[PDB]
């Protein structure tokens, strides 16, 4: 279970209760559950907060990855409903969690920011820079490649 | 720059009459500057440029230039009817001034801006109205007009003539071209220059 | 206390108001008055009318307004809160828990009006943050105001510049534009020309008369 | 700078030998909506207290202050033409009175447009207590002029807003007020050599 | 297989090159990116995949023989410019 | 040199309520500090 | 009128002529127009009707279009419309002129260098 | 040696090609040209100055106080080296490190 | 790494280019091997001394080699009794590119400094690039289950001088080095200088990938890999968008030229002012 929230990857909140929803609220004798997610009404709040973290871990996945989805792809993503999604997204785009705009009449979300003039040219004297030392490290080790084979 | 001007080299005439005015004599020679002030007028208005404003207010310019005053009024407004009311008016004073010529073919550059703001300030103009606002004889005859505009780079439209309307095009932000390094080129250079 | 009194109802920067509660608040503090509480709570509000509800809960934890920790501090608290999260139906559920420490004080009352209209502006803003084209309808929904209110106000918050969009009646959809920064290179290009400018022109008297 | 030196001393003014004090108020009221800012014109203007005071006996300028403000856009241009008369026979605003007029036409046609992405032109007429007609030429000559940032779609009567970046606007203000600098200093170096 | 240029790989071809349904393509892209497989993004409005990156491969002599050809043109073009500018700033270059 | 003062302390009561412009009041309240209390 | 545009007059010229000699010169200059004006509907126009040129064109028989087309290369299309469409050969920003670019900057350094 | 010793502070053909950042590039077109803003105010100053001022204190009162002309001479010097070198570098690499 | 730079001094040069002149006289020798001597600060090493020490190679074996490695620690004590702030910090020999036996000598220097630097020192005097090629041996754990073998990396090298190392090279460069050029024409040669060196360096590759054509070496599959890397990094500058933002940034350092430019001319107007105007005073005096 902490692996999948370390893996880089989206993760259906459906699949979770299916594969450890018993492991972590009822648990089993061999292996107790503690009383984080417990039947009584702190365990009930901590549930609702795991979906939370497993959809805002799914978003997070959604903003790397993905420059435009749809809103109904989002949700369907997200196991929500349109609405659902667009409010918990909402809430983490004015807490400045994760950018997105939501062109609510197309159904589009944008997850890239508006690029500005200064990011377009340093990303292109990035790839120079990055370039130029290749073609240097190349040359190195072009370098070993003659003098073993000489 | 007299000659450039009736050879219908504008541009190069506009340079040599702007250059003969610094290189007046700067107290005297008040006729002289009387006469390249007229021709100036008419060279850029020919080139479809604007006459500067501050040499109509001049003492000395102030009465020979408002003839050219009013006719770059006209011209201004890209009106053919106001234009044609100039002629009317002024045309002896421009035939005794040398100039009727040049003020002839102002006609074509009146056509000329008048489009040019019908296409700035109308994303979608009918064939009529673009008649009624040149003051043209029939939509028929302006759609010739405007179309010699496209082609001529006078203004970016599209013409329908099924529907009878033309559609400017959407203006291009100017600053993501190569206009403001050239037009800075020539400004920075001549600067280095001085 | 008669002093931010005043200087509240002639609706003036209430940073002074503020201030003249705060004295107040003191001066009641010290001879351990009944009045302390009411100068709290006007401190409180001042805060709020200030744009700063963040404020208000740090003055409340103060070890000299822990004594009148009560009803009149909660019902500034909890609107702080409101404002703080640009909730306006929070302000009216604070406007009915709290209805008689809040809408039934003259000083807060005749306040509460112009409190409505500043945290509508910010929950609107809030509502159209995470959009970039929005149907009014649902703005409305959100908002839970009526169309024509919603589209009147947005209008008037363009023409405020409070934000940048445009309205589109014929859709009923709010376009909120993602504008750029004005450059002040530019704009301290064309000041250095007008600044030099006048060099030239101070050039030209020292060019005619000395030659 | 008239708005912002006459605010700065509406409240510490002591000028009698120049004007009175309500005639004073009357001008910063007007040279405040042609320089100022709608957030600045409210702060300073609108809810400024000393010019409230004295708008209580110019029932005349409130009208015209708050019209543009409250957006009432007929009762507007009914006091922009009671404003022209006013300075028209004002000695320091007579030079001014066509361009100021103007401007706040201007001001108002912006701030219609300002909040919508398109509206009609009988909606604009209707707003305005004028014809279709008369905003039709009205918002044309400003657009050419570059003052109004929209474009007329005639053949459906809908005026479409446009968001121009402020960079245009500051280059063209580079190229136009450097263009008067060069010439200084072109015109310098002529009176230098000789 | 296709160049620097047409980099915008559509969902149907990922799906139909790879026997998967069009809404599994998205997954799939994914896990090449989460891995680090491919670099790139996902326009899932457009239904396109913007790869930019992807994990070098053994190549062949045919292969590499087109490699250096690529550099003939890149050696033509940097010594081209070398030559520009040493001819037109040959008065102020030290 | 208290009525120079007061005009000093008149200025300052502008500055404790920070305000631009100095009002009657503030040469009223200096008034009442430069000559009773003082 | 010719320079303005009003091709139509052009061609109503021809019986206005002021003398019997002035109707060579005449025949010479509409066969100029006629390319002329044709250059005019490729850039303004994206597509007209083939009749609607007709007019334009101030052709007589319907099949003095045909042959002029194929000199002038039109695609006919198949509801009796010219299609135009050759705008897409922009002044071609999508080209950075670096080459251009570079002469005139290292030209800005020559003027602050090479002066000594 | 002597050409041994020219290797000294030789910079990389790295650093020729490289561009200088954009951001910093423009904060400091930014920067140098506010200054200007107040120099061009200065210098205007100045140049009254000097006309009604005598020779003998041509140069004593200039000691201590800065000078708008030598300030503006070196911001501008040093903005078009700059921008010069920075729009050919990037020019440069245009063509150089070009995809097709 | 452990190191991030070397720094290698205008005295170092001189003296591996006079150790390799005077053993070179009595003896055509292939190259000359010598020791190291620097500090360490942060991780930029800082190559300040060197000494020679006696050295041989077979042509034929690389295997046979002698190194006084006796010499070396009795010449260490030398320079650590002078300097004690100079420790060895590698060794340097003067052939024109790296031999076999370069990681066996290592190995030899690695006892005495654990992360010691080889710097190839080149006397013959190459136009474009540096003489100083600093290189430090790692451990190179390959991914096709080859055994790990070791390897020298290379280190990025910069020769920089001490205040008065400084002043020495410039009293010996006073009469050659032309400092008359100003910044802008000294950047611009950087440019040309850049240009050239990425050329050679592209002919390198170029050069490698046609005899790996031809057969005249196996592939390396780490070249290739790298090389699909540098291929892939090449930008499109025919985008629409970056091509306006090409032009947008581009005219937005071109109005601070034109600033600069306008106000230079003005200034420039205003010294040929008080020229005339030194001038007439000067005459109307005489």
């Not at chain 1, 929500?80 to 979300?109: W, Y």
């Not at chain 4, 207590?129 to 905003?135: K, L, M």
Request: charged fraction near 25%; hydrophobic fraction near 40%; glycine fraction near 4%.
């Amino acid at each position: 279970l902490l692996k999948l929230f370390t893996t880089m990857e989206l993760m259906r909140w459906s699949t979770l209760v299916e594969d450890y929803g018993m492991e972590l609220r009822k648990g089993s004798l061999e292996s107790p559950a503690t009383d984080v997610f417990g039947s009584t009404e702190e365990g009930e709040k901590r549930w609702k907060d795991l979906k939370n973290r497993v959809v805002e871990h799914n978003i997070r996945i959604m903003a790397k990855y993905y420059t435009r989805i749809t809103m109904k792809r989002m949700a369907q993503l997200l196991d929500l409903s349109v609405d659902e999604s667009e409010a918990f997204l909402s809430n983490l785009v004015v807490n400045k969690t994760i950018f997105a705009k939501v062109d609510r009449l197309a159904g589009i979300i944008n997850f890239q920011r508006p690029k500005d003039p200064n990011n377009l040219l340093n990303d292109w004297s990035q790839k120079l820079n990055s370039l130029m030392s290749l073609v240097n490290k190349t040359t190195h080790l072009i370098a070993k490649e003659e003098m073993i084979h000489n | 720059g007299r000659i450039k001007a009736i050879q219908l080299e504008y541009s190069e005439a506009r340079r040599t009459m702007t250059n003969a005015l610094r290189k007046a004599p700067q107290h005297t020679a008040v006729g002289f500057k009387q006469t390249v002030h007229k021709l100036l007028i008419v060279v850029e208005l020919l080139l479809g440029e604007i006459p500067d404003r501050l040499q109509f207010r001049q003492p000395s310019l102030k009465r020979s230039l408002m003839p050219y005053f009013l006719l770059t009024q006209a011209v201004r407004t890209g009106n053919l009817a106001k234009f044609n009311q100039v002629l009317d008016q002024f045309g002896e004073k421009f035939q005794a001034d040398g100039t009727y010529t040049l003020i002839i073919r102002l006609r074509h550059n009146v056509i000329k801006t008048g489009v040019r703001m019908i296409s700035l300030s109308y994303s979608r103009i009918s064939l009529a109205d673009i008649a009624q606002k040149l003051q043209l004889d029939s939509p028929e005859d302006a759609e010739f007009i405007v179309a010699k505009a496209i082609r001529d780079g006078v203004i970016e439209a599209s013409i329908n003539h099924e529907k009878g309307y033309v559609q400017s095009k959407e203006m291009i932000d100017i600053y993501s071209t190569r206009e403001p390094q050239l037009a800075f080129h020539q400004r920075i250079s001549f600067c280095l220059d001085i | 206390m008669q002093s931010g009194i005043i200087h509240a109802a002639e609706e003036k920067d209430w940073k002074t108001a503020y201030s003249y509660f705060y004295e107040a608040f003191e001066g009641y503090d010290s001879i351990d008055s009944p009045k302390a509480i009411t100068s709290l709570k006007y401190m409180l509000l001042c805060k709020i009318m200030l744009n700063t509800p963040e404020d208000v809960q740090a003055l409340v934890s103060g070890k000299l307004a822990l004594r009148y920790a009560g009803r009149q501090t909660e019902a500034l608290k909890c609107v702080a809160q409101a404002s703080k999260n640009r909730s306006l139906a929070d302000f009216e559920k604070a406007l009915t828990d709290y209805r008689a420490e809040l809408r039934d004080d003259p000083i807060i009352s005749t306040h509460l009006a112009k409190l409505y209209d500043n945290l509508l502006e910010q929950n609107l803003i809030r509502v159209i943050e995470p959009f970039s084209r929005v149907q009014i309808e649902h703005i409305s929904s959100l908002i839970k105001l009526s169309k024509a209110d919603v589209e009147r106000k947005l209008s008037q918050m363009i023409l405020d510049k409070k934000f940048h969009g445009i309205l589109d009646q014929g859709e009923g959809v709010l376009i909120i534009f993602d504008e750029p920064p004005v450059d002040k290179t530019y704009e301290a290009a064309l000041e250095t020309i007008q600044n030099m400018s006048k060099v030239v022109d101070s050039l030209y008297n020292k060019a005619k008369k000395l030659t | 700078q008239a708005a912002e030196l006459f605010l700065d001393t509406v409240s510490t003014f002591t000028s009698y030998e120049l004007m009175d004090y309500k005639t004073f108020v009357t001008y910063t009221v007007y040279v405040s909506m042609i320089a100022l800012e709608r957030p600045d014109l409210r702060e300073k203007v609108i809810k400024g207290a000393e010019i409230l005071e004295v708008l209580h006996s110019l029932p005349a300028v409130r009208q015209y202050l708050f019209s543009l403000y409250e957006c009432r856009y007929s009762v507007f241009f009914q006091s922009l033409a009671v404003v022209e008369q006013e300075m028209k026979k004002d000695w320091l605003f007579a030079p001014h009175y066509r361009y100021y007029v103007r401007e706040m036409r201007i001001h108002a046609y912006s701030q219609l447009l300002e909040s919508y992405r398109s509206l009609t032109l009988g909606y604009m007429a209707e707003a305005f207590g004028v014809g279709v007609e008369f905003i039709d030429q009205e918002l044309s000559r400003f657009i050419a002029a570059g003052r109004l940032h929209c474009k007329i779609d005639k053949v459906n009567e809908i005026v479409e807003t446009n968001r121009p970046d402020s960079k245009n606007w500051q280059y063209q203000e580079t190229i136009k007020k450097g263009d008067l600098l060069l010439n200084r200093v072109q015109k310098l170096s002529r009176v230098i050599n000789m | 297989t296709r160049p620097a240029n047409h980099r915008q790989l559509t969902f149907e071809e990922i799906a139909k090159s790879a026997k998967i349904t069009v809404n599994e393509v998205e997954l799939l892209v994914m896990k090449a990116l989460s891995v680090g497989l491919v670099k790139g993004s996902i326009d899932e409005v457009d239904k396109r995949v913007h790869m930019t990156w992807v994990q070098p491969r053994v190549l062949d002599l045919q292969q590499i023989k087109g490699m250096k050809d690529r550099l003939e043109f890149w050696c033509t073009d940097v010594k081209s410019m070398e030559m520009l500018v040493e001819h037109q700033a040959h008065d102020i270059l030290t | 040199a208290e009525v120079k003062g007061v005009c000093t302390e008149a200025g300052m009561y502008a500055l404790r309520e920070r305000r631009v412009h100095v009002t009657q009041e503030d040469f009223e309240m200096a008034v009442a500090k430069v000559m009773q209390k003082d | 009128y010719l320079m303005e545009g009003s091709y139509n007059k052009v061609f109503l010229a021809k019986g206005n002529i002021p003398a019997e000699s002035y109707t060579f010169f005449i025949d010479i200059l509409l066969d100029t127009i006629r390319d002329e004006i044709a250059g005019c509907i490729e850039k303004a126009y994206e597509k007209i009707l083939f009749t609607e040129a007709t007019r334009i064109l101030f052709f007589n028989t319907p099949k003095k279009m045909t042959d002029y087309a194929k000199k002038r290369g039109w695609v006919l299309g198949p509801n009796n419309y010219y299609s135009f469409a050759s705008q897409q050969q922009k002044p071609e920003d999508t080209t950075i002129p670096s080459t251009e670019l570079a002469k005139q900057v290292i030209e800005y350094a020559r003027q602050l260098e090479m002066i000594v | 040696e002597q050409k041994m010793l020219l290797n000294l502070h030789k910079k990389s053909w790295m650093e020729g090609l490289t561009l200088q950042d954009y951001s910093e590039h423009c904060k400091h077109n930014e920067s140098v040209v506010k200054e200007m803003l107040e120099l061009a105010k200065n210098y205007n100053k100045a140049v009254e100055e000097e006309d009604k001022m005598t020779p003998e204190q041509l140069a004593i009162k200039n000691v201590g106080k800065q000078d708008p002309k030598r300030h503006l001479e070196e911001h501008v010097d040093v903005l078009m080296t700059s921008n010069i070198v920075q729009c050919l570098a990037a020019m440069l690499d245009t063509v150089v490190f070009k995809l097709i | 790494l452990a190191v991030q730079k070397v720094v290698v001094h205008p005295l170092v040069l001189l003296s591996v280019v006079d150790h390799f002149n005077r053993i070179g006289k009595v003896g055509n020798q292939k190259r000359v091997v010598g020791v190291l001597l620097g500090s360490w600060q942060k991780k930029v090493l800082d190559v300040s001394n060197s000494f020679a020490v006696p050295f041989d190679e077979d042509d034929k074996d690389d295997s046979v080699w002698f190194l006084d490695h006796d010499y070396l620690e009795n010449m260490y004590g030398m320079f650590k009794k002078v300097n004690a702030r100079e420790r060895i910090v590698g060794w340097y020999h003067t052939g024109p590119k790296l031999h076999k036996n370069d990681i066996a000598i290592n190995e030899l220097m690695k006892r005495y400094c654990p992360n010691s630097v080889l710097v190839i020192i080149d006397v013959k005097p190459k136009d474009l690039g540096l003489p100083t090629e600093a290189y430090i041996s790692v451990e190179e754990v390959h991914d096709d289950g080859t055994p790990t073998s070791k390897t020298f990396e290379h280190v990025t090298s910069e020769i920089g001088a001490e205040e008065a190392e400084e002043v020495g090279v410039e009293h010996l460069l006073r009469d050659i080095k032309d400092t008359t050029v100003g910044t802008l024409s000294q950047r611009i040669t950087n440019q040309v200088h850049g240009l050239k060196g990425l050329n050679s360096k592209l002919l390198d590759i170029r050069s490698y990938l046609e005899k790996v054509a031809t057969g005249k070496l196996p592939i390396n599959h780490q070249i290739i890999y790298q090389l699909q890397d540098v291929f892939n990094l090449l930008p499109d500058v025919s985008l629409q968008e970056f091509v306006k933002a090409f032009y947008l940034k581009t005219n937005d350092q071109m109005v601070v030229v034109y600033l600069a430019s306008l106000i230079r001319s003005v200034v420039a107007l205003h010294n040929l002012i008080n020229n005339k105007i030194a001038n007439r005073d000067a005459e109307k005096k005489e």
